[PDB]
Amino acid sequence: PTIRLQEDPDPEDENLYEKNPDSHGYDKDPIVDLWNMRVVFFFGFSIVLVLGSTFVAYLPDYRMQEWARREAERLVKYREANGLPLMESNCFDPNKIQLPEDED
Amino acid sequence: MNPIIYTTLIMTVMSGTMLVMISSHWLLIWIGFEMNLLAMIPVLMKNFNPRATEAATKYFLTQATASMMLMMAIIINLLYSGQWTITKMFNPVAMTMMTMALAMKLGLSPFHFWVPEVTQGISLQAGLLLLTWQKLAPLSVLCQISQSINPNLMLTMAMLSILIGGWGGLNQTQLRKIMAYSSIAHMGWMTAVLPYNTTMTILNLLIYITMTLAMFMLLIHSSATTTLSLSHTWNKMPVITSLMMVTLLSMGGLPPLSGFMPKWMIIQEMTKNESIIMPTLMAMTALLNLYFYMRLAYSSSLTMFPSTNNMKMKWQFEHTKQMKLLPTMIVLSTLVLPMTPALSSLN
Amino acid sequence: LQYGPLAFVLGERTTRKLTETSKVITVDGNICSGKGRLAREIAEKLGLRHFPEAGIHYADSTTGDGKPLDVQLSGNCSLEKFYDDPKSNDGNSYRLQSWLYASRLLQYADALEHLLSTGQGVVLERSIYSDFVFLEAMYRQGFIRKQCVEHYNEVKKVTACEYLPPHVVVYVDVPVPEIQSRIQKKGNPHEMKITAAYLQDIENAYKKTFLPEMSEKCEVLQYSAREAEDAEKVVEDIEYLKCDKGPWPDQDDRTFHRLRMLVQNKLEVLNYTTIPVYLPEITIGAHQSDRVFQKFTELPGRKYSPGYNEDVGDKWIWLK
Amino acid sequence: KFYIREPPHGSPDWLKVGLTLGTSVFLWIYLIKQHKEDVLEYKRRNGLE
Amino acid sequence: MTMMSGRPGRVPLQFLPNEARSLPPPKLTDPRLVYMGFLGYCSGLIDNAIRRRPVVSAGLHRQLLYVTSFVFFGYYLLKRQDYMYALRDHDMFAYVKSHPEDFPEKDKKTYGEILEEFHPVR
Amino acid sequence: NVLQIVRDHWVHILVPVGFVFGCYLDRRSDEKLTAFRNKSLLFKRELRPNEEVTWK
Amino acid sequence: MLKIIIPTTMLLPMTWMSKHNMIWINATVHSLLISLISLSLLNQLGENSLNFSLTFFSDSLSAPLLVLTTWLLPLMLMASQSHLSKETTTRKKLYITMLILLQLFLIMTFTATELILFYILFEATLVPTLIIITRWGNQTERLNAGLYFLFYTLAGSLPLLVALVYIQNTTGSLNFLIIHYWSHPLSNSWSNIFMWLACIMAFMVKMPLYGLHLWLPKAHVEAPIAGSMVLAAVLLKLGGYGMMRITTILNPLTNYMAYPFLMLSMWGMIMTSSICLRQTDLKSLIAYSSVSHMALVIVAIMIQTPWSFMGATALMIAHGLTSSMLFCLANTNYERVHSRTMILARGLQTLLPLMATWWLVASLTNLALPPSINLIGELFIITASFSWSNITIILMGMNMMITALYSLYMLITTQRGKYTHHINNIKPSFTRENALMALHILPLLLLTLNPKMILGPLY
Amino acid sequence: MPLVYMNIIMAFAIALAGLLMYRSHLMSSLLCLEGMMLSLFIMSTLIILNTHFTLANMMPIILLVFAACEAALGLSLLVMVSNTYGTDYVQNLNLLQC
Amino acid sequence: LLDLIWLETILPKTTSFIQMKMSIMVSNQKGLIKLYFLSFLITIMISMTLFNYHE
């Protein structure tokens, strides 16, 4: 036969615009395609995007940024008035630390 | 062959294995091995042809040599301590000979040549029996004498078995030889952890037996013994090829599949000892088995090979005989990893 | 209960049902000869089951409903275009020959299963032992290649060796010019293009290979055209045969058990017809294979197992 | 519709169906009973109630 | 090496010693039992698919039997597994209690007295 | 007529039901980790005259 | 966090029980709802992590990754339904099943509290990806691509398993909280050096580190579009997540074991950026872009500073979004002209203006135009490297120039010039493709508006 | 051990070596197998007689029984091989490879 | 030079070459019991001396 095998020919690609000039590119069935467009748009842009962005914008301050700012204001006020240094090099009281006896 | 005679021979094979497993006397264990071999020889020749005759002859010669060495080791042990009970094996030379004889019976490398040949020469049912049921007796005996075993010899043979299983399997287009090399590698894995923990040996044996049963039953369902004949199964029963693909993935050891569990537990057990280098090499080597399982999956399930015209006639008919345990075997081969802590009931 | 080792262990034995009228009969002959009428008359007189010659859609007749399917999903070959274009470059000739051999193997398995299950005789038109005459006629006329002949020989070698040959072979002899006259008188516009050399090749193949090698298994009953209309004489000629020369008398219970397990399970029967020998005439690409299989699975009674297709009126599925 | 008997007929095999359902129900009630006695025995041995 | 093969008082083929009755049985809603039932349901589905039957609807009695059998075996499997782990813990604690020299409780040191080297990241 | 509507769109309750089941199981999991409820040095508190537990 | 895991497991039978013509709709809607639910994980604390149970926990490093995974699922669904139209119903359901299983494994991987469970899930992610690539790829190179993807990964990951079980036998636990609180320094011995290498190489090959990246161009070019999306956006970030987790127990050994990987990362960053300048395949260019950005991420993780960790987190999120968008943009042209060669279809701005705008925005984010989170991450990493050593700015500086060059080269080659005369089948952009590009790009700028949500736990 | 024990063990080793190296005939290797069985019988009998283990006097009979079973098995296989090839050469058993 | 040749040459191509060569070495046996029973004899003798003589 001068052939090697029985095979279907490679078919041409279908244009969704031919049977549906406003086809939205979701499906060949116009009704299913239209509703796929609608659900994608509503649940992506209207619900997740805008409402999720609002939710994230108004999340309560569990990172304690404002609490830390107010605590630092109290500490600075107290230390400035008393004449104490604003900050201490050692964050742990040396009285609770026991260095090794001998360094030689 | 008469069905009654076939059933009698199968029960005699199983009776020999059970006699090995329940005996306390070395003579009774040797008798169990003899009975098992005597009944097993005709089962390999059930479908008579020159290849089956050659496979039976090679099997008989190998196993008879192994049993002769087994008996000699028993007699030497008796000579140096008048004990017939299966115990710590008071003599080292006798223990070495016993280890070599049991390795010959199992098909561990260096004595691994017979397994690919006997498996290719017999039918798929005989291969199923040979690669599943025939491992129980030597492994049970090895488990009972694990304390007196010399780690250097057993570990050498286990690592050689893993290496040779991978390398030999890399070169095969016949499915029975692929199964035989896979069996060799899994035997190596089983015997690598034996000196440290026999529960892991039992767990690996059970999981391997389940996966092997599933694979052989899938191969019998779709009557394929070569890679190219298995490449047609997609055009007749695609579900069979999909299940075979998942089972092949499980055999490879990829998580979250059940196949991964024995290797994981054996690696953990070996690292509970010092033993760091050996598990690393064993995993790197099991990558080869994974490679040729993946090649089989490429050929049978993930791509579609050309078919023939006469497959249309086969489309019209159904499979008459049905294997009742195949779904359970597939499920146990694939989805059992979350139940891993249940291995405690094995000890 | 399904026949198997358990049925053989207790009770069932084939050797007891054979009642001197088992006698697998095949009635061979060239094209357009009246072998079918003779076969039907023999079956009616002797009380045997008649099997009409297996065509392209023989396998369709036995599964699902007996109605034939589309040629694309069954056969994928045409007898008419074989006569129109015997030298087509699409492999129609050898594809048809291979499909017909597979159909004949299936029909032989069905007849053997019926005989071994009931003890009743069967009459066939042609057999797997006769199918090669058409292959030789095609090859000598240059309609197929030599590789196709080698593939046919491989499949026949691994398939036809597992069964028992017919007890008696009946041959109807009709000369080639008379065959041409009959074909012209018929009226079918495709059979008129059959050259006389094709019929001569079929006749040479028959008389120089089939009958000689079949006469060693069992004696052959040959008949000229005029002595084939008298069916009662042929039947009474059959009743006085001494059949103790072939493999049939040397069959005991266990061999019959093996053969009976083989004749059922038609997948086992057809196993070796689809061997992975890649001839362009019969090799089908993956895309076309997938498309045709998807087409087949959409037939009204084909998606599931027989008793499980609710779209053809299967009830109580959820308890089966 | 079918050319041959197709032995599984339109009605299901009632013997097999009944045996299957009976086995399932027997196993379920046995498991419930066993769990109840196990709970009672555990509570008795450790003296909870 | 076999850790529990020869523990005194062990009955050869019991699968469930009388001592195990002193442990709380697994709840019938144990997630492990539910996973075993899921395994049985998967086996039933695969059985339907292999036999070319409607996968979800073909045999409800068969699927029920599959799920029930897997749950039934899993219950006793879980009981035995829990018993083995309880045995292991019991033996561990008894051995530690009976060999005080090998398990000393040394003096506790606070982090204010332990000198740890500091490795800068720069 | 709701028979066909239900048989065509009953697959739309699986995911919300899974969500509520996951919420329930998370509450159940939280119920098993109360060994230090109202016991930390930082949050130890005297109970109100009516309440029973500080958190659920 | 079963309130997220269980709905995906319910996506599975919802897909397998749907009508033949509603699978895409149902999967998309419920995937988007699951993403909305996962959005609640962004409420993180300042001191410790959210410890849901003994098994699952959520940190400030894994919450954006989970959100990215759940958001990527619907986009893959929209991108896949075009070229799968001729497929049978069962195979379409199997494709969706593969995607759902991949999402489930990824979701469980980012929240596992133990390292062995994390390993099991991070390795289970292999099977769906390999099946997708080798079954639904287009060309015959997909088989080799699958083999390369599998073995490169496993050869790195198995020593990690050995090291993990060894560590558990040594310290008694693999729980991440216990590991962090009970951390002890690593001495300078050959055993410790090889333990470091075993704990690091799997994540290195996942990034992938330069010289160990050859699998990535093959796998990312030969895969279908959804495969490429999930391979570039999420699966590469497994290496970075695992490396930031595991480096807790590797100090102070890292102080000098990081040198070869740092040199490889910087020089191979330069090399892969240069490779992008001469590339005839449009998808391979995007793959090598991914390699360069991940080399930057490797450097940031290796130098071990708070600023470098913040930059690494931001860069991983930004790169996921940008690379997924670029792959989708290339797939549109491939579906139009059935060829990947970059100079075949030219002057496309004349024929498709809105798609040209999408191309411009994607290539602007690729070159890290401020104040995009791409640039935030890149600049944090550059500052951290400058503090590490002042000479890194030269290598970093060269990379910035090269990245701009090849990004705009891609843009000008594909969009500008004159349209090829012989190609007349360039249909207008569908609504689906435009919605896909918009859903890729809008979250990027929205995250720019509030950048502390992607800056990690070191913030 | 005495000299007789070493001699019997040497006989066993020689028969094993004989079995391991095949010449042409299969029957010669079967004879070597029987020789190993005989050597084991002699060794076990000597050990049991020396230690006066009365109940162990019956084991060598069992050994002989199973030796006979093994020899019958080997002879049957030889009959089949010879019927296939008209010769009992081990060179003909080369249809299956590794 | 680097990505398409040498990086390919060292890690994956070397591994493939070595595995293929060892597969050819291991799997190509004639199936003659004489040769590998001689192999068995060598293994047995080595085993007694190498691992058995050292206890």
Ligand SMILES: CCCCCCCCCCCCCCCCCC(=O)OC[C@H](COP(=O)([O-])OCC(O)COP(=O)([O-])OC[C@@H](COC(=O)CCCCCCCCCCCCCCCCC)OC(=O)CCCCCCCCCCCCCCCCC)OC(=O)CCCCCCCCCCCCCCCCC
């Ligand atoms: C981790 C979390 C949990 C996950 C658990 C693990 C995963 C899920 C469980 C796995 C096992 C379960 C299913 C087993 C049977 C499936 C076999 C099968 O063929 O299915 C076809 C069958 C369709 O057949 P049909 O409907 O009769 O008619 C169509 C024809 O049959 C048309 O059929 P056909 O034969 O003509 O079509 C040919 C097709 C047929 O080939 C197949 O169908 C392949 C199926 C192979 C089964 C998987 C192997 C064994 C399981 C191992 C899974 C490993 C998972 C771990 C990760 C590794 C990934 C592999 O073959 C191909 O097309 C070749 C494609 C090549 C792709 C290769 C990939 C295959 C492996 C993928 C496995 C992924 C997991 C399962 C996917 C789902 C399968 C349904 O599918 C189904 O309809 C059943 C699925 C749905 C059942 C569950 C629904 C439950 C009820 C709903 C309510 C839920 C309750 C909620 C409670 C709360 C109250 C509201």
Ligand SMILES: CCCCCCCCCCCCCCCCC[C@@H](O)O[C@H](CO[C@H](O)CCCCCCCCCCCCCCC)COP(=O)(O)OCC[N+](C)(C)C
């Ligand atoms: C087509 C035509 C285009 C041009 C025409 C457009 C017309 C103008 C519209 C453009 C708007 C201009 C932007 C200017 C900024 C104003 C908004 C800003 O003020 O809000 C920010 C808030 O923005 C949000 O916080 C950021 C949005 C969150 C982004 C998350 C994306 C949603 C999920 C989607 C999928 C996720 C994928 C990525 C995975 C990680 C402020 O943050 P914050 O300083 O606090 O507020 C202080 C007061 N609070 C705290 C009480 C609220």
Ligand SMILES: CCCCCCCCCCCCCCCCC[C@@H](O)O[C@H](CO[C@H](O)CCCCCCCCCCCCCCC)COP(=O)(O)OCC[N+](C)(C)C
């Ligand atoms: C791949 C999945 C593996 C599945 C393997 C088969 C599962 C189904 C087989 C059903 C087992 C039936 C046996 C139970 C009936 C009573 C017999 C009982 O008395 O046997 C006891 C023994 O109990 C059995 O071993 C328990 C069998 C349970 C095996 C399942 C564990 C698999 C590991 C975890 C994987 C998850 C499995 C999920 C199953 C669906 C006797 O103990 P003992 O005589 O003193 O031990 C002898 C061996 N020693 C001394 C050397 C230790």
Ligand SMILES: CCCCCCCCCCCCCCCCC[C@@H](O)O[C@H](CO[C@H](O)CCCCCCCCCCCCCCC)COP(=O)(O)OCC[N+](C)(C)C
């Ligand atoms: C293609 C991309 C692949 C990925 C790249 C992976 C990178 C791996 C590189 C490993 C980094 C360092 C490994 C070991 C640390 C130091 C290396 C050594 O050269 O340093 C000196 C080591 O001295 C000498 O070099 C001895 C090592 C010589 C033998 C090593 C072989 C190197 C040859 C190159 C082979 C290529 C390796 C990669 C294969 C692809 C330090 O002196 P010393 O203080 O004494 O040793 C420190 C350890 N102590 C403290 C326990 C003693």
Ligand SMILES: Nc1ncnc2c1ncn2[C@@H]1O[C@H](COP(=O)(O)OP(=O)(O)O)[C@@H](O)[C@H]1O
């Ligand atoms: N195996 C075959 N190969 C090719 N053609 C065949 C074959 N069998 C039957 N035919 C064709 O079928 C037609 C009639 O078949 P035949 O049985 O000979 O006539 P009738 O219908 O009278 O029995 C003829 O054209 C014959 O060539």
